[PDB]
Amino acid sequence: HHHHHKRKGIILAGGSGTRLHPATLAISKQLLPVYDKPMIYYPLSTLMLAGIREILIISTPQDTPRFQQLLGDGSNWGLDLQYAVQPSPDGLAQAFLIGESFIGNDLSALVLGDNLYYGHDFHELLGSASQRQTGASVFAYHVLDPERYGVVEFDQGGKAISLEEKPLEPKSNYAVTGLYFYDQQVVDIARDLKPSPRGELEITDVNRAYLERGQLSVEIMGRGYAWLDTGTHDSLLEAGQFIATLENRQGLKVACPEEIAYRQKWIDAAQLEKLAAPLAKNGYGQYLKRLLTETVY
Amino acid sequence: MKRKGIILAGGSGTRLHPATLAISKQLLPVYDKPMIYYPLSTLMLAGIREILIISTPQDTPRFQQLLGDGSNWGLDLQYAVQPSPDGLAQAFLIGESFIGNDLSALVLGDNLYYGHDFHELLGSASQRQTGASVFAYHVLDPERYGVVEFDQGGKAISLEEKPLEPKSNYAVTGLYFYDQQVVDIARDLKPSPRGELEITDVNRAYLERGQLSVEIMGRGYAWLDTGTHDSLLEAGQFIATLENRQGLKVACPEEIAYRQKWIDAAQLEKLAAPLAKNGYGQYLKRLLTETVY
Amino acid sequence: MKRKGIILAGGSGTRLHPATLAISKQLLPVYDKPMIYYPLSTLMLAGIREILIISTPQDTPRFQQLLGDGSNWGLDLQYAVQPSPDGLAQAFLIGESFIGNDLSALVLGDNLYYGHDFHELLGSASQRQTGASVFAYHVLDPERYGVVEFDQGGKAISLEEKPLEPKSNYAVTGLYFYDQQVVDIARDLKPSPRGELEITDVNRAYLERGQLSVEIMGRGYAWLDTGTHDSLLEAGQFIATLENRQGLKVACPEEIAYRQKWIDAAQLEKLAAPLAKNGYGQYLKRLLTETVY
Amino acid sequence: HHHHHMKRKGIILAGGSGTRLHPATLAISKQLLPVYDKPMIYYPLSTLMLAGIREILIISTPQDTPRFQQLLGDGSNWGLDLQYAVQPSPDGLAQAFLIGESFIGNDLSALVLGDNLYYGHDFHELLGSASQRQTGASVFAYHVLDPERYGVVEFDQGGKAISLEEKPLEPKSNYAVTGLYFYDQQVVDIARDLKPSPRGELEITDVNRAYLERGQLSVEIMGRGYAWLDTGTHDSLLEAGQFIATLENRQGLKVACPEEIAYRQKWIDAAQLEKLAAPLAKNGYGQYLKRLLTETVY
Numbered sequence A: 001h002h003h004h005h006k007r008k009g010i011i012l013a014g015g016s017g018t019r020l021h022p023a024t025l026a027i028s029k030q031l032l033p034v035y036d037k038p039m040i041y042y043p044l045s046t047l048m049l050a051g052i053r054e055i056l057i058i059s060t061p062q063d064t065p066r067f068q069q070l071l072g073d074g075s076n077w078g079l080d081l082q083y084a085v086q087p088s089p090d091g092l093a094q095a096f097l098i099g100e101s102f103i104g105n106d107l108s109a110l111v112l113g114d115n116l117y118y119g120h121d122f123h124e125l126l127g128s129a130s131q132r133q134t135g136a137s138v139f140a141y142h143v144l145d146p147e148r149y150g151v152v153e154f155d156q157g158g159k160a161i162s163l164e165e166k167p168l169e170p171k172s173n174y175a176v177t178g179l180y181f182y183d184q185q186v187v188d189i190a191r192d193l194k195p196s197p198r199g200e201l202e203i204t205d206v207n208r209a210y211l212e213r214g215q216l217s218v219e220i221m222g223r224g225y226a227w228l229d230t231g232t233h234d235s236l237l238e239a240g241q242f243i244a245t246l247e248n249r250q251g252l253k254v255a256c257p258e259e260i261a262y263r264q265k266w267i268d269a270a271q272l273e274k275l276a277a278p279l280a281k282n283g284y285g286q287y288l289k290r291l292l293t294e295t296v297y
Numbered sequence B, C: 001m002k003r004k005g006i007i008l009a010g011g012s013g014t015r016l017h018p019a020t021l022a023i024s025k026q027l028l029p030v031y032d033k034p035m036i037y038y039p040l041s042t043l044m045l046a047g048i049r050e051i052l053i054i055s056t057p058q059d060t061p062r063f064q065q066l067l068g069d070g071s072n073w074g075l076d077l078q079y080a081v082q083p084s085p086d087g088l089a090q091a092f093l094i095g096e097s098f099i100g101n102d103l104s105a106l107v108l109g110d111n112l113y114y115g116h117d118f119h120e121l122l123g124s125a126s127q128r129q130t131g132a133s134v135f136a137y138h139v140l141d142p143e144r145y146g147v148v149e150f151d152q153g154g155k156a157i158s159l160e161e162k163p164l165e166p167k168s169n170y171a172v173t174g175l176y177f178y179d180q181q182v183v184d185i186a187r188d189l190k191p192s193p194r195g196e197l198e199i200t201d202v203n204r205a206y207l208e209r210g211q212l213s214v215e216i217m218g219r220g221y222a223w224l225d226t227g228t229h230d231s232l233l234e235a236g237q238f239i240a241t242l243e244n245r246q247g248l249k250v251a252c253p254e255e256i257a258y259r260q261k262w263i264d265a266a267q268l269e270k271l272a273a274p275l276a277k278n279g280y281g282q283y284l285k286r287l288l289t290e291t292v293y
Numbered sequence D: 001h002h003h004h005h006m007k008r009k010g011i012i013l014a015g016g017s018g019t020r021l022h023p024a025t026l027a028i029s030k031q032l033l034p035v036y037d038k039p040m041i042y043y044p045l046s047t048l049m050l051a052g053i054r055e056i057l058i059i060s061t062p063q064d065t066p067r068f069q070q071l072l073g074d075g076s077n078w079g080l081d082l083q084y085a086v087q088p089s090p091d092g093l094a095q096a097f098l099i100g101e102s103f104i105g106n107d108l109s110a111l112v113l114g115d116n117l118y119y120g121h122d123f124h125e126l127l128g129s130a131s132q133r134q135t136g137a138s139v140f141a142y143h144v145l146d147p148e149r150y151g152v153v154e155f156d157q158g159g160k161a162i163s164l165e166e167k168p169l170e171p172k173s174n175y176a177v178t179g180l181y182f183y184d185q186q187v188v189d190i191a192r193d194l195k196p197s198p199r200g201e202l203e204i205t206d207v208n209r210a211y212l213e214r215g216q217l218s219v220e221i222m223g224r225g226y227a228w229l230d231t232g233t234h235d236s237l238l239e240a241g242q243f244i245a246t247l248e249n250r251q252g253l254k255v256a257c258p259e260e261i262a263y264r265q266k267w268i269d270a271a272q273l274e275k276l277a278a279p280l281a282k283n284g285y286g287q288y289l290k291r292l293l294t295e296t297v298y
């Protein structure tokens, strides 16, 4: 007898194989900076903006200690961070098997460790996805090269009717972004997956499962949002220039976890002041200190 | 006479944290390759094959794992540790036994050079068996560097490290050539007011005896700024623009080794095997069948 | 009336480091099972099935991963976090919604009890549906604890938290029974000179209102705490001596749940299976067939 | 074409102890349990360190690996280079050399079991002898009451080792081979040629017999004045805790304190040791590290 009287996050920050070698031979791409902070800050900030405090980071055995040195156990930012290893990159859906015990009986969210989002009312858009308790939620975004992604086809009335992974002839230009919200059915859906031609457990197959059951919500992420990934050397450079333009224009940072934790009330002024101290001599610590006196709307 | 090389890829403190919290700055990519490929390339272009890499205690394994012992590229690489960021001149104390009685050269691990006939300009400094050679480059913010003053006739007459009031806009770049005197000069150095053993004091020592050759690195050369987030980005975009225009890579050690005949066609083919699926391996395999002038 | 249980498994900072860097303290074993099984068993022996486990943000998920919802043992387990080690009395504020309008019991996570008819001693306190009930135990070092003073007739006349000059050698143990007032009492409390919401301050409130019952836990009971390296070791040896003599286990939740009829023979059988290869699983299997008085 | 200007790499087998110590180990895994005042894994780590070994590979289950990584990091705080590898299945102690193949590379190695603790006078010197011989293998033999539980070494009348048997029901001697092994460059190749035993495992005893049969096994006696303790049962863990507690409380000195060992080895200096003492200053361990900065201990 069970008794019924929340949502957990996962960041997949595993090995990107050899695609970006030699740039990534020495370290994981999710530890590479995007302008002024490690790539992993961005997806972490996305989970935090969704209200998620308990987060599992999945990385290679080789890179886990570096993530741990960077992020700790989360206590400094009002979070709980746990770690798991992915000995070989067997696909995105494997996160749910690796993370089965972490997830337990809760709702979950998966974000890719190399995905960056930017836009207005983003916090509010993540809230509406995270509050929806049943089924699955994903976001669709108009791209130039939909063949690189999971692609969602829509009927005349705007209802999602099919998902295809990396189709040679996409039915739309709407790619599924690297952020996914799941109810308690996901671990059992993943467990029943069998590997694709590439030998991978595909997230698209998980999402198609929900779709066939009429439990997939596909929200359009509009053109006034930037969804960037750091898939090529050129795209990583563009992403850093994009963040630098916005930050240097505004004097506000994108995806500063200390800031977000503070604005969420997960840490207070006294704790924020402490986090600022060791970086007092550089731009980042000086930003954190300013946060304490300034009202930002 | 033999010249040994030293790459100093030490700690940049908290200056670029949290971007460098996880990993030292010289293991970060500039566009498509680890930042250290660029100084290693500079030394290779100067004809230097025996090279010591000095890094933090934490990062030396990450450099050793990246570069190996060098035999795959016709190099002889060794590694050593700088436990504290106590000055660029410490390189010659750390590297004393490595250097032995040979000629030497020091390059900073975050220094990026681009321009015409770099191979020639290095070859001339490397051939000088006595004295020291450095390069001065016109910059906008000379205060950040070793600043060199010249008399009306163009002769180097003074060096100041990070002066409050620069005597010129000519900064000394992070590439130094030295004869057999440099270890003994470094050994007698005392810490500065900042608490560092200064490369500029080494260079002043050579200067007082008229044995410092200060060559001008002209405006037609790129000495790229890697000191800030803003400038690491600019450098990435500079390399990308060159490589995407030309279809030729800047600072590809495999290619350089191949062109200096340090490895043969069968060795370069084996190096391309692992990267075959990506742009870098494709580049290395194309090198074998194309004449580049 | 139903009584709800709270186990406070609070953070012990870095007092037990590096032992507890490996895993937090109420997850460390006392001889052959996790520390938290003992206070859980105490609650279970008082007839309490609905239990809230409060711990740190980092530890609470590990307790959840160990114990789950308790359905396997006929329990109803829930979890809550205490952000900062800001006093034991915060348990009632953190736990306000869980407690609802019911009576409660609080047990500290590092407290171990052993003795004859402990079951019956818990029953007496469990059924007093008004006021609060605590237990006094004669100890050698009363200064470490909440100390209770008695007068000539053995009536409790004062409570003092870790007094420099103890008025008696009776310590109040880490087990507390409370009525419906305790949440409002905790809400009105003003933090102590130490800067922590004290449980002794909750107990003084009840005392001053003439509503605190102090029962003697006699010398034939063992009350141990496992809060230091030394004390954990001594507790391990004590449990080992009892268990190896008797061939019976102290604080086995499965056994207690089975003997309380909260799970049946079929359920206990299933719980034994995964543990079949060790002494604990063979023990649960033995309990299906053996009569133990 | 190679050049010279020898390094020995360490491996710690911190494998999954199955269910044998459940439910104690449901919460935290075996080599993360404390022996008195520090995690079990500190003891075999300290042993490798005392042998002069700085580059160390830790092999554990996928679930345990990040817990070890959270405890120990990359080692750089203690002047070490710690690496990690996963053991998917409990397929024998010899599997360490296949899992650890690329880590070892062309170097000498040492393998230590995660649950072995050693204590005694100039253990440092004893390990030196073994660490220094750059060819063949070296093991240590120790008189025990229950040789049946271990690999057992038989000696002839002149004290030369003549056979090794794995967990024999009828032991030829009371000399068990302890869980610490030194190997030359041949071990990986010897290990690749092994086949599962009747028990279904790649057995270290088979590796050691291969060296013995080539006359390349050194068996040094670890004498009765050394303590070699096993920490793999509830009773034995508790006995090991009591033993360390008695020594530390008598001496005011710690057994198997990695920070202390790296400081005395000159792998980290006084300033770095002071940094490490900082966060732990609230307890006996940080205060102990602090005291080491001012006290001369012979």
Ligand SMILES: Nc1c(O)n(Cc2ccccc2)c(=O)[nH]c1=O
Binding pocket: A045, A049, A122, A123, A253, A254, A255, A256, A259, A260, A263, A264
């Ligand atoms: N995107 C974004 C924000 O919206 N905010 C504002 C915010 C965060 C949390 C709670 C209320 C407001 C940031 O501080 N950083 C960000 O990157």
Ligand SMILES: Nc1c(O)n(Cc2ccccc2)c(=O)[nH]c1=O
Binding pocket: B041, B045, B118, B119, B249, B250, B251, B252, B255, B256, B259, B260
């Ligand atoms: N700068 C530069 C080169 O000049 N060359 C040509 C070269 C190298 C060595 C000997 C003769 C010619 C490169 O292949 N890569 C380079 O980055």
Ligand SMILES: Nc1c(O)n(Cc2ccccc2)c(=O)[nH]c1=O
Binding pocket: C041, C045, C118, C119, C249, C250, C251, C252, C255, C256, C259, C260
């Ligand atoms: N102390 C103790 C017990 O008395 N019992 C027996 C019992 C439990 C519940 C109800 C009736 C009898 C145990 O199984 N474990 C114990 O630690």
Ligand SMILES: Nc1c(O)n(Cc2ccccc2)c(=O)[nH]c1=O
Binding pocket: D046, D050, D123, D124, D254, D255, D256, D257, D260, D261, D264, D265
């Ligand atoms: N066994 C043991 C030691 O011998 N030493 C002394 C030592 C270590 C390294 C170099 C010289 C001396 C310890 O500090 N801790 C120990 O556990």
Ligand SMILES: [Cl-]
Binding pocket: A119, A120, A121, A122
């Ligand atoms: Cl906005």
Ligand SMILES: [Cl-]
Binding pocket: B115, B116, B117, B118
């Ligand atoms: Cl040119």
Ligand SMILES: [Cl-]
Binding pocket: C115, C116, C117
């Ligand atoms: Cl009894």
Ligand SMILES: [Cl-]
Binding pocket: D120, D121, D122
């Ligand atoms: Cl000794």
